[PDB]
Amino acid sequence: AVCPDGTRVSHAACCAFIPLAQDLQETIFQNECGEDAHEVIRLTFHDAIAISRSQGPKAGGGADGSMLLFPTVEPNFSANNGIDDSVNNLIPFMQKHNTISAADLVQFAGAVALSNCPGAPRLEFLAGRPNKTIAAVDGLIPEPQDSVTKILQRFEDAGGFTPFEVVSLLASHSVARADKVDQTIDAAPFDSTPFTFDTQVFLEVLLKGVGFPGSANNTGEVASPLPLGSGSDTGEMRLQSDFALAHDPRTACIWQGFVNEQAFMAASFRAAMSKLAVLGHNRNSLIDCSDVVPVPKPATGQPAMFPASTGPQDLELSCPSERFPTLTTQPGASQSLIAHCPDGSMSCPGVQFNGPA
Ligand code: HEM
Numbered sequence: 490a491v492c493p494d495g496t497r498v499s500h501a502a503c504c505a506f507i508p509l510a511q512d513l514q515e516t517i518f519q520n521e522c523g524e525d526a527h528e529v530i531r532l533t534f535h536d537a538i539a540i541s542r543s544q545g546p547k548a549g550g551g552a553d554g555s556m557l558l559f560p561t562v563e564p565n566f567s568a569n570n571g572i573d574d575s576v577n578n579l580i581p582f583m584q585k586h587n588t589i590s591a592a593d594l595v596q597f598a599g600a601v602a603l604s605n606c607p608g609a610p611r612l613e614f615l616a617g618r619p620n621k622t623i624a625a626v627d628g629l630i631p632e633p634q635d636s637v638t639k640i641l642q643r644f645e646d647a648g649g650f651t652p653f654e655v656v657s658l659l660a661s662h663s664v665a666r667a668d669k670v671d672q673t674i675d676a677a678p679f680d681s682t683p684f685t686f687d688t689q690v691f692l693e694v695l696l697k698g699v700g701f702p703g704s705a706n707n708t709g710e711v712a713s714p715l716p717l718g719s720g721s722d723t724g725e726m727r728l729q730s731d732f733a734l735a736h737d738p739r740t741a742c743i744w745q746g747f748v749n750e751q752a753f754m755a756a757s758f759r760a761a762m763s764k765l766a767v768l769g770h771n772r773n774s775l776i777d778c779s780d781v782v783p784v785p786k787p788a789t790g791q792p793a794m795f796p797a798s799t800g801p802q803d804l805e806l807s808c809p810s811e812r813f814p815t816l817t818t819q820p821g822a823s824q825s826l827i828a829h830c831p832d833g834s835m836s837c838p839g840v841q842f843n844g845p846a
Pocket residue numbers: 524527528530531534571631632633634640658659661662664665666667668669670709728730
């Protein structure tokens with residue numbers, strides 16, 4: 490079909506997603522893999538994973554827009570602390586782009602956001618999820634203090650995910666920061682390149698922790714290998730769950746397998762997201778609108794590298810059967826600050842709408 494703007498696409502039903510992408514980019518992302526992009530990507534996961542095979546449909550409808558349609562319920566669960574900002578940012582689009590379901594909006598926005606992160610895959614995007622659902626129940630969202638057994642169980646119960654798929658999905662922590670885990674600091678990044686969809690998170694979680702970016706006593710957090718911060722350039726934070734996954738026998742080799750393997754990581758993330766984005770639905774009942782997902786920013790193609798102040802002697806390895814790759818180290822004796830802003834600065838306040846969540 491040919492859309493009003495003259496864009497030729499796969500199906501007429503995909504046309505409305507074009508101005509929605511444009512509005513999202515102009516209004517909240519500005520084509521950056523920044524704060525607002527990060528929060529929406531997190532929302533795609535919190536929306537989708539709230540489903541349970543064993544509990545039945547009454548527990549939650551998966552990728553169903555429930556966070557937007559019931560903004561006062563799930564966003565106030567403690568495991569959803571901080572999700573309100575992303576919900577409040579997407580609700581005005583739901584009201585404006587009113588031929589697109591809340592559920593479709595959430596998944597598509599996540600694909601758009603990810604496209605701004607150099608190295609990310611161009612996600613599959615199927616459309617047609619209904620605009621009516623129920624509020625999910627509490628306890629369906631994995632938490633950083635959770636054990637690996639509990640985490641893997643939750644993912645298997647939600648949609649049959651394998652441990653490979655689970656770790657694949659955690660490539661999103663390559664473009665992720667923490668605002669709620671520590672009450673004193675904000676935007677503590679999970680890797681030294683939170684604006685780049687690279688494999689640094691996999692490497693950096695395997696280094697010996699040497700301090701904390703904030704307090705040493707936060708639930709769900711463990712020591713960080715790069716805790717130095719200054720001004721708004723908060724130090725790296727390490728989640729207990731990421732650390733646990735990197736060292737548990739079930740997932741240690743998969744974790745290490747993404748180190749310095751960009752295309753493998755990206756391809757695996759795309760495959761897992763294909764499954765996550767249609768939880769609560771039969772994919773044979775959704776139309777393919779992948780062609781209206783923006784083309785992602787390409788990676789530079791550079792190998793993963795040890796950040797300054799770290800090196801191979803700092804590795805805590807847990808995969809007996811696979812050789813840890815030979816990597817270079819960025820020159821310098823002391824840790825480099827991790828920039829708060831995509832353009833290297835420390836001042837870049839994102840657009841935030843007030844709302845019901
Ligand atoms: C065992 C699984 C996981 C756990 C326990 C976990 C936990 C967390 C935690 C605690 C935060 C910090 C939130 C804050 O305090 O502001 C976070 C942020 C993030 N998560 Fe995860 N997560 C998991 C899986 C996922 C998955 C599967 C994705 C998406 C595909 C996702 C994407 C992100 C993003 C993008 C952020 C950054 C948000 C921002 O910087 O504003 N996470 N995660």
